[PDB]
Amino acid sequence: ISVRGLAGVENVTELKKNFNRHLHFTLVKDRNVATPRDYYFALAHTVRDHLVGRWIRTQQHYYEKDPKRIYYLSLEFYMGRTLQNTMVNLALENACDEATYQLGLDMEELEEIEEDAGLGNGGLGRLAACFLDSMATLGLAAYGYGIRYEFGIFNQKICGGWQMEEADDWLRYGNPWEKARPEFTLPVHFYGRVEHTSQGAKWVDTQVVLAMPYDTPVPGYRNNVVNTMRLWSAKAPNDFNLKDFNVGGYIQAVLDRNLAENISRVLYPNDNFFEGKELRLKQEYFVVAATLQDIIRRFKSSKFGCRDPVRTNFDAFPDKVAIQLNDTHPSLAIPELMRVLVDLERLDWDKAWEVTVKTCAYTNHTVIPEALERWPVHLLETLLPRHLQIIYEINQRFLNRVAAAFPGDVDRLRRMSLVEEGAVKRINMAHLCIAGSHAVNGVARIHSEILKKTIFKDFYELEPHKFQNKTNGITPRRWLVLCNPGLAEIIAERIGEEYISDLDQLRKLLSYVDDEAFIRDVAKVKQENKLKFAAYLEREYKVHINPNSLFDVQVKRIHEYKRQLLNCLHVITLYNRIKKEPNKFVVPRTVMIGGKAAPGYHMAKMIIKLITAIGDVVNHDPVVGDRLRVIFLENYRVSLAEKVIPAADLSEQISTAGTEASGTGNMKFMLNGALTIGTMDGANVEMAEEAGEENFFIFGMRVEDVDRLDQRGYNAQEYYDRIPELRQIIEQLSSGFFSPKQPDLFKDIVNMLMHHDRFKVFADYEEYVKCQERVSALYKNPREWTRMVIRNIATSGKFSSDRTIAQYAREIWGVEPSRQRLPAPDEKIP
Ligand SMILES: O=C(N[C@@H](Cc1ccc(F)cc1)C(=O)N1CCC(O)CC1)c1cc2cc(Cl)ccc2[nH]1
Numbered sequence: 001i002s003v004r005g006l007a008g009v010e011n012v013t014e015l016k017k018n019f020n021r022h023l024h025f026t027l028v029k030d031r032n033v034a035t036p037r038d039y040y041f042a043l044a045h046t047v048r049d050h051l052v053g054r055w056i057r058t059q060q061h062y063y064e065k066d067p068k069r070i071y072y073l074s075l076e077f078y079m080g081r082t083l084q085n086t087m088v089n090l091a092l093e094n095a096c097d098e099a100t101y102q103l104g105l106d107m108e109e110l111e112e113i114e115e116d117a118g119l120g121n122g123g124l125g126r127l128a129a130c131f132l133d134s135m136a137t138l139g140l141a142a143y144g145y146g147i148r149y150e151f152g153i154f155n156q157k158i159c160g161g162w163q164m165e166e167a168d169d170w171l172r173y174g175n176p177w178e179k180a181r182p183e184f185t186l187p188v189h190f191y192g193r194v195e196h197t198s199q200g201a202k203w204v205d206t207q208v209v210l211a212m213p214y215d216t217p218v219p220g221y222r223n224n225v226v227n228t229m230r231l232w233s234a235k236a237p238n239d240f241n242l243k244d245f246n247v248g249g250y251i252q253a254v255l256d257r258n259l260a261e262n263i264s265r266v267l268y269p270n271d272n273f274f275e276g277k278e279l280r281l282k283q284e285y286f287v288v289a290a291t292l293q294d295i296i297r298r299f300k301s302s303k304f305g306c307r308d309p310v311r312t313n314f315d316a317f318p319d320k321v322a323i324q325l326n327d328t329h330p331s332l333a334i335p336e337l338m339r340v341l342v343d344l345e346r347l348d349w350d351k352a353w354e355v356t357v358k359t360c361a362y363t364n365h366t367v368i369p370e371a372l373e374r375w376p377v378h379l380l381e382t383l384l385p386r387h388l389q390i391i392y393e394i395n396q397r398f399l400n401r402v403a404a405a406f407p408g409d410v411d412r413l414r415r416m417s418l419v420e421e422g423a424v425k426r427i428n429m430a431h432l433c434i435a436g437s438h439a440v441n442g443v444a445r446i447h448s449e450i451l452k453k454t455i456f457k458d459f460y461e462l463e464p465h466k467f468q469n470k471t472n473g474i475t476p477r478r479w480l481v482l483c484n485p486g487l488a489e490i491i492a493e494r495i496g497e498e499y500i501s502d503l504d505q506l507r508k509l510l511s512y513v514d515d516e517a518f519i520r521d522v523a524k525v526k527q528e529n530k531l532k533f534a535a536y537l538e539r540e541y542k543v544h545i546n547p548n549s550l551f552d553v554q555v556k557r558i559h560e561y562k563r564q565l566l567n568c569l570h571v572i573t574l575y576n577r578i579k580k581e582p583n584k585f586v587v588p589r590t591v592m593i594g595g596k597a598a599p600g601y602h603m604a605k606m607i608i609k610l611i612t613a614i615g616d617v618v619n620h621d622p623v624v625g626d627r628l629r630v631i632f633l634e635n636y637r638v639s640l641a642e643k644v645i646p647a648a649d650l651s652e653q654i655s656t657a658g659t660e661a662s663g664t665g666n667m668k669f670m671l672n673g674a675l676t677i678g679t680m681d682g683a684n685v686e687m688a689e690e691a692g693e694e695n696f697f698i699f700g701m702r703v704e705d706v707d708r709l710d711q712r713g714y715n716a717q718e719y720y721d722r723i724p725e726l727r728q729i730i731e732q733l734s735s736g737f738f739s740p741k742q743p744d745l746f747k748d749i750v751n752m753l754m755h756h757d758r759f760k761v762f763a764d765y766e767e768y769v770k771c772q773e774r775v776s777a778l779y780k781n782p783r784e785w786t787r788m789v790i791r792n793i794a795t796s797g798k799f800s801s802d803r804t805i806a807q808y809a810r811e812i813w814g815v816e817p818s819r820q821r822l823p824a825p826d827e828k829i830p
């Protein structure tokens, strides 16, 4: 059937009886009233049963061996479905496929029933999920720490071509993969005031919120390791949230509990954009405060909570603990670690600070200013008064270091300050993270250089040893074996299975680039993937597409910097050239654009409407026929990404040079047989450097040309004046050619493009359509298109998150990865 494992005689029988055990005892149902959702839950429990033994022994193992622990703090974990991924890393896929077949069920139909764990917005959240998978596969004692939102990223709906947002009640029917640990509840404080008494400060008169943890197992790939993702949930204390007496009403007091619990209620839907709301900051401190007490409690047990030098010596703290900050969201970990170490444990400032800097590391994910976290001082002052004092003291000592290092440079002083003066004073969280971490990294070579050369130049001059690079990566398990079993099979038929946990081996596929059988195969799985997606489109969304055309797809969050608009202009150009010469031959294309817009992002929502508007005209022009279809992919999420990517021919990564830190969708496409048309931005540079530029479709300005244009001054009118085809499009948008009933509907987009285009869309237009003509020419030659594809796939090995994690571990955390199988799952009950 494929190498989804073995379908052993005894195991398929065992799986079947356990499926039935659960349908009966767990779901309280009988085959006569069980719905597909019941069957999915019976399977979920049956599979989940296989990792409880491993989970207990892994955790038990880390306790006995006591290695250095890695803690990944992120306010986002974009996990997706988890049934298939668990079967994959456990080698249960074929067994479970057989077992359900015999029970008369379709396993694929059942997997579609599982809800996505959408606790993330996009790139940042998915990276943490991939990292988790890699850290388990590499045998690292790691824990993911975050928040358990009952409502994740909103479900996107298209109404009249407009995006509509609807609550993501993903827990509605239950989450079989989480394990509530009520017995580990912790208290988090808010507000209050600071009292300075004899032997130290005291944070007093605080409001308490309880933090209840829910653990989700994270299984390593076929190595019997199961790590833990701990997500906190807000719970109201039953005392004060009722006990603070003297009228108000008893009923009201109970109802008002949903005020303390609103903290873990919903995820903020912003991607690469900062919104300074109090509720956000509360979530940020909530995850930080609970996680730290948990980390310190675990440390106090270790082997110190037995003997060792005897005396709670936090000197060894950094030898046993490493906490990674995914962006600046969990940045309050720095001042909170100081609060505990100094205010509670009573360490002297300097020892506390040495410890903090040595255990904390920070990862930067973007350079656009509107994404930077600058919290108003009055907010931190009301909510976390003690933390504000600590930040001031950290700032004081840091600026003293600066003044010493660069005497008289008064401007460098104000530029480097953690406290920004002006309208309202604010705290620059990124500056805080640099000062309190022993390492700061970019997510791609180009982005990391931009950090040192631009944004954090002053810091790089002060402490150069701190800045590193860690190019992102994706996990080959979910992004190859799970979503593209076909391509994974034909690759394994030739080079083995060892590449699944050592992607570098894909390079061996290079020697099959001239193999007639392989070329036919690689091409065959892509055709099968395209046919299946084409089917899915009519099944769940309904309105046909031609599977023989080139599948042009750009899927990611909708942003001005990602330039979905530039893709739009190319689509209109194609349409116009067809209408001009109808009986001329052109390579058929199905351009698919998908992604969610943040609810408050007006321009982004206007772009979605443009895209659907364009498809309304194009898809109904009889002269166009089936040569050009413009389709907007609804509700783009992880599970949907697993469907499109394997079916794509052209991956669109056209952000303005210097704006996309790294990108990860680009890597997903490269590994699944799509060719890439993009700019020299983020990881794109390293990808084309790995495949060779001849095997990539690069175009547009490079970082340097963008800066040259900025010195000169960007004027859109020039491009509009010199390019007739461009002018025609803009006049088509202005006159209402795409919005008849509302002729001025897109005046906002045209205005922006012409007068305030921060991402110089027009500047890259000519080179973009010229380059698109080249891919169309290569597509016309199936054999040569496929061979280039093989060059990309065979050369994507470097973008596996296992490589990224091995680097973080070795160069930042100080731990050695290991591909050693943990001692079987075998029963055991001590
Ligand atoms: O959720 C699990 N078990 C139940 C077992 C259970 C069921 C009912 C009950 F009243 C108490 C415990 C549970 O502890 N919670 C159920 C929901 C409740 O609100 C909190 C506790 C669970 C077991 C398990 C094993 C693995 Cl390997 C992974 C995830 C898991 N979740």
Ligand SMILES: *Cc1c(COP(=O)(O)O)cnc(C)c1O
Binding pocket: 121, 122, 123, 126, 555, 556, 557, 636, 637, 638, 639, 641, 662, 663, 664, 665, 666, 668
């Ligand atoms: C990988 C992924 C992303 C990131 O895409 P980019 O093109 O790097 O911005 C976002 N959302 C989902 C659903 C993903 O799978």
